[PDB]
Ligand SMILES: [Mg+2]
């Protein structure tokens with residue numbers, strides 16, 4: 001919103017005009033009148049935005065040449081050109097050479113303010129998404145998978161991605177889109193698992209809300225693009241039917257709508273269920289299944305690609321540090337082999353969760369110290385007492401204490417009795433009363 | 437980006453010109469000439485972008501009134517206006533009423549393409565941000581969390597330097613950003629430097645910037661922070677040579693870039709954070725006390741998760757939805773049984789640790805009946821074993837005690853842990869544990 005803006009123009013009245021409007025708005029303004037004075041200002045402190053006279057006469061660099069030098073020094077620094085009456089061609093060329101936009105003399109305030117609000121807003125947006133975009137394996141299976149993606153992507157066929165939960169099907173779907181002919185169209189996702197079965201039709205098909213406002217459903221939003229249906233198996237009965245029509249008709253009704261909307265979508269499905277078995281029990285539709293499954297893509301379980309795990313661990317650490325400010329640590333080779341040999345029912349999500357867990361537990365140890373196999377949980381390699389009121393908690397505790405002591409004495413009740421502080425028959429009676 | 441662009445203009449020749457230039461470029465175009473045709477096209481299908489004649493002669497609604505209706509229907513659908521020579525005041529007014537930008541007749545292709553491309557890009561980024569935000573993944577009504585909000589408010593209007601102090605994985609960065617948002621620098625930059633994360637080799641460059649080999653310049657954080665606030669996350673991990681330089685910056689309000697000679701002037705308000713007291717930093721030996729005092733003119737304490745256990749259910753519930761979006765896992769009800777464990781734990785790693793454990797639970801119950809409650813036996817050792825619990829051969833010190841002594845130790849530990857769980861509220865603790873209030877007071881004295 002407020003910014004340190006540098007105004008470079010060879011005319012005293014323009015610098016004064018621009019600087020004054022921008023200051024009046026809340027910005028901080030600096031001025032220059034040629035290449036040297038502009039580059040000296042930039043050197044003093046990089047500004048947030050630059051207004052640059054496109055001609056800039058009586059200067060060592062013309063306006064475009066200066067633009068080039070600015071962009072070389074600060075690639076991400078937005079620059080809006082100030083152009084003359086009917087120098088549209090030259091202005092347009094400035095944009096090819098790196099300028100964001102231009103404003104044409106003469107102008108009053110509102111026009112300039114708006115040009116500047118836009119340049120800053122878009123610049124800000126570019127930086128938020130660039131950061132967020134920060135926040136792929138050697139094995140046979142993953143080479144086959146890459147190979148599969150590349151063959152299947154440039155077709156126009158519906159894809160069904162199959163594999164277990166957590167194996168990273170969404171990533172495969174985005175890969176497909178990136179190499180498809182719809183790569184510059186939209187990529188829209190529907191988490192069929194996640195959305196309430198009630199709201200599912202509104203997410204898919206949209207609707208007119210009470211105010212007159214419209215919710216554009218995912219099909220409509222995906223027009224010209226790809227729709228990725230995640231875990232198609234969690235789709236309701238009436239919703240399956242209605243998607244079947246869409247695949248064939250290429251048309252649908254909005255919830256509560258009468259208009260039949262035409263779209264041109266390419267659908268990618270995924271599932272970790274066995275759908276053929278769901279057909280057999282009448283839970284999912286056969287005809288729907290076959291149309292969604294024309295070309296299949298299989299995503300390998302972590303256990304199918306064990307070779308990849310070290311680099312995956314290494315990768316998730318780089319990323320977890322980004323996401324949480326924790327200096328990444330080295331994993332010790334005994335613990336790494338235990339990671340490498342687990343079955344990973346939750347696959348990549350599960351592996352990430354565990355790596356994140358180790359980094360949290362070892363946050364604030366000597367950085368040269370290794371993550372050891374001691375730290376991994378019981379799954380790798382009924383009721384809690386705290387949920388119980390006093391009488392019941394104490395009874396759980398007596399029971400489990402007695403069982404523990406009994407095992408520690410190898411089943412010898414008389415020895416257990418003596419140690420725990422009871423007469424033998426009384427231990428037997430107590431054990432029975434606690435349900436053993 | 438190719439896109440579905442509706443073109444709305446009362447002149448056949450303008451629609452033709454626009455739709456044709458846009459088509460040559462690869463877009464899919466549709467056209468209309470008045471409100472009824474424009475709204476029917478939007479009802480047939482929602483376009484990605486609208487060009488709209490600012491005047492729109494021969495129409496039920498003029499261009500401005502049509503802009504109100506389009507925006508009401510589709511608030512995020514960008515609309516670029518087509519205006520005439522000298523219509524700037526009206527164009528400006530269109531922007532106030534929701535238009536993204538305008539183009540002024542006469543125009544040829546290049547100029548029209550640029551306006552389209554920009555409008556599509558900006559609209560794309562607005563969505564791609566909010567989408568990437570959901571795909572990455574201050575809550576609470578506790579006494580402590582109310583205190584923190586009240587403190588943020590009292591402190592934000594100062595000009596003075598803030599030191600935020602609190603345990604790791606508490607949400608200190610968020611506290612920083614809530615302070616920035618209520619300050620007089622809310623419209624300036626907020627810049628973060630995580631001292632722990634940056635290799636100390638690169639710490640000077642990250643902070644103070646440098647001229648790279650190409651001629652390309654790297655703007656350091658301090659310089660980027662000009663006009664705003666710079667957040668020095670975990671200052672303790674800063675090298676002494678960097679400490680010395682920050683001290684000069686605080687008082688000179690100036691600095692040299694790595695390898696540079698210009699003294700860059702800046703106007704930054706520094707907010708700092710750490711997990712340790714002053715006594716701690718002296719004993720560690722790393723960090724200068726004079727600097728510490730100057731970075732901590734106004735203190736803000738971020739309470740540990742154990743000091744606000746009352747918020748654990750809201751945070752559990754909150755993190756489930758976050759995770760449910762970020763990872764495609766259906767959110768599930770945590771059983772009251774498992775919530776009691778979660779709530780009773782002291783969370784040495786605070787919000788990060790809690791979140792990571794909620795993620796864990798949700799991954800481990802991924803292929804279950806949607807009704808079936810999440811249970812405590814899926815929690816790791818560090819959560820379950822630090823609390824009063826059913827013993828096991830593993831626990832040498834319980835196993836060395838006879839039954840009554842073991843039981844009495846357990847009652848004590850249990851009651852203290854439940855008191856803590858309910859944030860010290862005796863009445864509620866008593867209600868849960870099965871006791872009347874005075875009886876609970878009397879039992880506590882009887883056990884020490
Ligand atoms: Mg000039």
Ligand SMILES: [Mg+2]
Pocket residue numbers: 445446447450489492
């Ligand atoms: Mg017209």
